[PDB]
């Protein structure tokens, strides 16, 4: 019957909206790392290759 | 008496705390209370090493500077006196600088007179 019809109504758009909830925490799960990974390893480098010039240099001094 | 003019310009150090809250600048006679048993004598030859004579920042060059590094010692064991051949000589930072250094060992004498050279 109808009137558990309305009990169906009310739950077919629920489980879209954990869905998109979700979709949004995978994502940003995601996307959180992404410039973290990218930002850190950059300061990796650039100090790697300071942290050797400037011995380069030093040594240049002797 | 009237040849000296008040500071009017820092110089930078390698060291943050000796620049900020006190900060270096030229013709500053900046004592430094060592103590007893302290590695105050490291803290000089290694923050020795890292200076490099800077205004910069201010809208000066660098160029023109000329970097005279003197060093002297006095009263030295054994252990320190290494401490000494591996600064300087570490690199070529001995590439700026003098040595003049009376042990304890050598006559107290000669010590007296040991700054007034560099000086």
Same mark, same amino acid.
């Given at each position: 019957?109808?009137?558990?019809?309305?009990?169906?109504?009310?739950?077919?758009?629920?489980?879209?909206?954990?869905?998109?909830?979700?979709?949004?925490?995978?994502?940003?799960?995601?996307?959180?790392?992404?410039?973290?990974?990218?930002?850190?390893?950059?300061?990796?480098?650039?100090?790697?290759?300071?942290?050797?010039?400037?011995?380069?240099?030093?040594?240049?001094?002797? | 008496?009237?040849?000296?003019?008040?500071?009017?310009?820092?110089?930078?150090?390698?060291?943050?705390?000796?620049?900020?809250?006190?900060?270096?600048?030229?013709?500053?006679?900046?004592?430094?209370?060592?103590?007893?048993?302290?590695?105050?004598?490291?803290?000089?030859?290694?923050? @020795?090493?890292?200076? /490099?004579? $800077?205004?910069?920042?201010?809208?000066?060059? #660098?160029? =023109?500077?000329?970097? &005279?590094?003197?060093?002297? @010692?006095?009263?030295? /064991?054994? $252990?320190?006196?290494?401490?000494?051949?591996? #600064?300087? =000589?570490?690199?070529? &930072?001995?590439?700026?600088?003098?040595?003049?250094?009376?042990?304890?060992?050598?006559?107290?004498?000669?010590?007296?007179?040991?700054?007034?050279? &560099?000086?």
């Amino acid at each position: 019957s109808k009137l558990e019809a309305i009990l169906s109504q009310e739950v077919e758009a629920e489980i879209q909206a954990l869905l998109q909830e979700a979709e949004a925490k995978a994502e940003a799960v995601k996307r959180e790392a992404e410039e973290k990974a990218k930002a850190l390893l950059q300061a990796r480098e650039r100090a790697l290759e300071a942290q050797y010039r400037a011995a380069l240099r030093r040594a240049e001094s002797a | 008496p009237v040849a000296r003019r008040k500071p009017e310009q820092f110089i930078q150090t390698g060291i943050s705390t000796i620049d900020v809250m006190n900060t270096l600048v030229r013709g500053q006679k900046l004592p430094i209370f060592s103590g007893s048993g302290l590695p105050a004598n490291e803290i000089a030859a290694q923050i @020795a090493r890292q200076a /490099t004579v $800077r205004p910069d920042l201010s809208g000066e060059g #660098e160029k =023109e500077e000329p970097f &005279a590094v003197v060093f002297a @010692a006095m009263g030295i /064991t054994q $252990r320190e006196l290494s401490y000494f051949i591996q #600064e300087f =000589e570490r690199t070529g &930072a001995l590439s700026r600088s003098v040595l003049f250094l009376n042990k304890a060992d050598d006559p107290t004498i000669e010590r007296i007179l040991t700054p007034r050279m &560099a000086l």
